[PDB]
Amino acid sequence: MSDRFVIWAPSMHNEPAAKCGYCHGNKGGNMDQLFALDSWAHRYMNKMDVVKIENCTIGSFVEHMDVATYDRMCNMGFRRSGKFLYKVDPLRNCCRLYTIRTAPQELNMTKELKKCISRFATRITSEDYCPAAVASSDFVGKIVNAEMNSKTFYTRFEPALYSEEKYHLFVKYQEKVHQDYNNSPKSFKRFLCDTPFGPEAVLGTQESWEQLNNWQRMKPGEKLKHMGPVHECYYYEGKLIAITVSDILPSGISSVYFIWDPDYSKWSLGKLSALRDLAIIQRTNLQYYYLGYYIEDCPKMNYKANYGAEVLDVCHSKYIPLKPIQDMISRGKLFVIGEEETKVTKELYLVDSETGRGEGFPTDNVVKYKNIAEEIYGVGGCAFKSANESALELKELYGIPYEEEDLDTIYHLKEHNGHAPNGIPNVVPGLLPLWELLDIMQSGKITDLEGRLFLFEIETEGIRPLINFYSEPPNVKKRICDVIRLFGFETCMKAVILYSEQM
RNA sequence: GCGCCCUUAGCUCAGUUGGAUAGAGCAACGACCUUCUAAGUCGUGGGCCGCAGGUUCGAAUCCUGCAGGGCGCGCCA
Ligand SMILES: [Zn+2]
């Protein structure tokens, strides 16, 4: 209990584009960003008026997942945001997302923000007192040893729980900068108190917290044992003015949000948490700092570019630094990196390994990459014809209810408003392409997992062994292999999958 | 994220915060001692400068820049 990987069958629940929190479905005269790329933009310009563009969501209702398994998941792209563990395919949807990582050892921050760190260190010091005037090329030295020998601004680590003290600034700040004058209490309990991470992992032992607050003088090499969300309050005198919210994985730290007190924002609390929590890595033995979820379609997130982020890729699990591809990722275009064996007529082969399913790939710094995703799932790419016939063989090979769709049926018609078109699109770079699934059955690798997994329906509550693969209903079998196309091959081996019918 | 502030001894301070780093308390020596030159009072002597350049006989000193020293509060899923 509370230790196995739990993920339900994804169901693309869709809503009108007005409900979108970032894009609203309107981006002026920038219809190229709305669709995949320019190739279909030149052809769907007159067809977009007859086909509605909604806000597609790809995700599932998860219960709990162990920290070790989720580390791949947050590296894959399925970053936690509430209990709806979700992701957005890079092809169709109007608001794409994918995890990013930052490295504090060699971050290439811009010179514009270099003046910001010069401001917070002067005021905090107690005037005459100075820790000697020496060279400070590494900015760690003047912050770690200054927060403890004074009472200017001291912090304290806390778990992710409920605290009444934060409520005062949690409401007024939204009423002040977010214009959210109607804040029910459920907006705090749901967001930062019910996480998919294991409750024992969040609790752990206080010893991990004890050494965590001792990060200032702890010697590197000590074994860390912290895994889960983190809350680092920002005390001042005898109150709080900022609340840090982030999640520390067993391999890195992922940040989400920030909160200020409206009028008590004297000490420029916004940039303090960011600049004094990526320096945790140097003092500890951690390796990664995840900024969270990146959105190119939302211009507001451009400040995260200065954080040294890392635009991810979900089709091939190959990290690539944000700055070298700053222009390439612009305008909301697709981003799938090819290989030396690039082909414009055959689909991509996939790899299912313990370390080769989103557990880091070897990367070279000085490399002039090129974009090949445009020639795969677009007008100029011939891979669509091969994908069109790929679905035909799936139906006549084993008997799984996957039927192809016509040429002008890639997106739901505006006449489909009266009947919700529940289903999983086949042309999705995030989803496993049909090329690899075809080789799975031929190679016999599907057989090993066959006969070991149990059929588990939420509305049935029945346990029965699997002896004949074709005896189970095909519609249920359809949902089983859908997750195999989305959530790592092997993976599902150490996991149990549930299904949703028409939720 | 943008703003105006000051970048001189181990310290506080001068040179309208541009033309020698000087007094004073400290630690040093000493004609200064009833064994108060290791708790009097007087000569004072080592303690000399920050990272780069910038436009001028000139730079502790109009500072664009950087690391470190001052002040409203921000386009912060
Ligand atoms: Zn959207």
Which nt sits closest to A259, CA to C1'? B76
Ligand 1 centroid to Cα of residue A347, in Å, is 28
Ligand 1 centroid to Cα of residue A26, in Å, is 9
A137 touches strand B (CB under 7 A): yes
A351 CB-contact burial (10 Å; exposed 0-12 / middle 13-18 / buried 19+)? exposed
Collapsing DSSP states into helix, strand and coil, what is residue A475?
helix
Task: Give the resolution value in Å.
Answer: 3.6
Q: How many CB atoms are located within 10 Å of the residue A365 CB?
A: 7
DSSP string, A162-231: --GGGHHHHHHHIIIII------THHHHHHHH--SB-HHHHH--HHHHHHHHTTTTPPTT------EEEE
CATH architecture for segment(s) A114-294:
3-Layer(aba) Sandwich (3.40)
- What is the CA A139 to C1' B51 distance in angstroms? 14
Contacts with A310 (C-beta within 8 Å, 6 or more apart), sequence order: A100, A101, A102, A319, A320, A321, A322
User: Are A245 and A258 contacting, i.e. CB atoms less than 8 angstroms apart?
Assistant: yes
Domain boundaries, chain A: 5-97+309-498, 114-294
A7-46 residues near strand B (Cβ < 7 Å): 21
Ligand 1 centroid to Cα of residue A96, in Å, is 8
Ordered alpha helix ranges (H), A1-104: 31-34, 38-44, 67-76
Q: Which two tokens stand for residue A132?
A: 């000697």
A258 touches strand B (CB under 7 A): yes
Q: Which two tokens stand for residue A264?
A: 């008590």
Taking the C-alpha atoms of residue A384 and residue A434, their distance in angstroms, rounded to an integer, is 11
The identity of residue A501, as a single letter, is: E
A228 touches strand B (CB under 7 A): no
| Nearest C-alpha neighbor of A414 from the set A47, A95, A96, A90 | A47
Q: Dmax over Cα atoms in chain A, in whole Å?
A: 82
Q: Which two tokens stand for residue A104?
A: 């504090």
A328-357 residues near strand B (Cβ < 7 Å): none
| Nearest C-alpha neighbor of A308 from the set A97, A98, A103 | A103
- What is the CA A217 to C1' B28 distance in angstroms? 39
Burial A25-45 (b: 16+ CB within 10 A, else e): beeeeeebbbbbbbbbbeebe
Taking the C-alpha atoms of residue A312 and residue A208, their distance in angstroms, rounded to an integer, is 30
Taking the C-alpha atoms of residue A149 and residue A206, their distance in angstroms, rounded to an integer, is 24
Ligand 1 centroid to Cα of residue A177, in Å, is 22
